[PDB]
Design a protein around this ligand. Sequence first.
Ligand SMILES: O=C(O)[C@@H](O)[C@H](O)[C@H](O)COP(=O)(O)O
Ligand SMILES: O=C(O)[C@@H](O)[C@H](O)[C@H](O)COP(=O)(O)O
Ligand SMILES: [Mn+2]
Ligand SMILES: [Mn+2]
Lengths: 189, 189
Amino acid sequence: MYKEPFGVKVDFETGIIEGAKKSVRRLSDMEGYFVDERAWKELVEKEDPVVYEVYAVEQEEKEGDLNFATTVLYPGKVGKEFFFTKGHFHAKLDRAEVYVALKGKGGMLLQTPEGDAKWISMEPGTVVYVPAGWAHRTVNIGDEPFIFLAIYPADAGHDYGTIAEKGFSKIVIEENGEVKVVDNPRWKK
Amino acid sequence: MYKEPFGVKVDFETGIIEGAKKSVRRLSDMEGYFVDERAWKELVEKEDPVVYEVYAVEQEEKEGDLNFATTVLYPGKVGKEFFFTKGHFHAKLDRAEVYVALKGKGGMLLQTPEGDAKWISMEPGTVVYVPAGWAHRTVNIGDEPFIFLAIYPADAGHDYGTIAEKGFSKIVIEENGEVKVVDNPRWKK
Ligand SMILES: O=C(O)[C@@H](O)[C@H](O)[C@H](O)COP(=O)(O)O
Ligand SMILES: O=C(O)[C@@H](O)[C@H](O)[C@H](O)COP(=O)(O)O
Ligand SMILES: [Mn+2]
Ligand SMILES: [Mn+2]
């Protein structure tokens, strides 16, 4: 009645976890996520680039168990908006998460169900505490891949739908060569 | 009713987490842990070196929340035995843990309550999955500090007493210039 311990190699330079399957998110997999839909359509038509890749080592859903995963968030913009992850709440309202930044320049946008927002800058060595109840999205604000490792409860689950429907209350853009976190004009509540 | 997200800087070269207090474990804090008690007494008398330091960022005990901590496990031997951490089970039988090796050369010794053992080699980039129910001890098998980051449930707790009383069923030693994991002669069960 004991699971076998194991070790796996993670390459901090590439984000690749040996033996884990690469899950790929292309821009075409993110319809309705970016503010500039015309820019989205244009970039999908012309290229449809990879926005991010995930390597996950996950256990069966069980209270007390832990998953981990790396993300390689590629550099880019859709109009003014930097490339980002889809973003989600956890399905369980009482499950936190820890991120460890490994490479590149980025940050995390978090929000509560009421839309109260928080931005946390991430550079290599930044550990981010994602408290229970906060939706979380990472953003690449640089010209190189933004790579991090996340450790999360095996029963936290995922709620992508809420973010797919309403988005985040803030967006992260480049204006006149500088990074700005500003009100999302599509956000209601 | 939402905790504030935060980011903290971890130096992967030193293990130091900015703003966290250094908890120091000297050899004198580890009476009855090493097989060669005469060597232990001698080294405590002569020097009483730091065996390891921990930097912890911990939340209040709450189901679903996560702690993280770095350890700097210094190089050394007590007789034939490499420097190691005290080792513990978690108080809760259904709480796993994830370790991320950052610097140096080491490994993890794990065991179940029945004494069934597992050794996992750790070099930078090795992520170790510590399943529920397994006691866990890290060992520095090299000449430089062995540094890692651990992420664990905020309600996992600690049972040091079981290990203090009975020890691990295996010990990690140097014999004729090579690292060996062998039966602990003090182990009973
Ligand atoms: O565990 C997490 O929350 C992360 O590993 C994310 O899943 C990952 O960064 C990809 O983002 P998303 O799940 O929002 O598509
Ligand atoms: O969370 C853990 O299990 C680790 O951070 C250890 O506590 C740390 O390495 C120090 O070892 P110990 O707690 O066995 O003294
Ligand atoms: Mn998550
Ligand atoms: Mn532990």
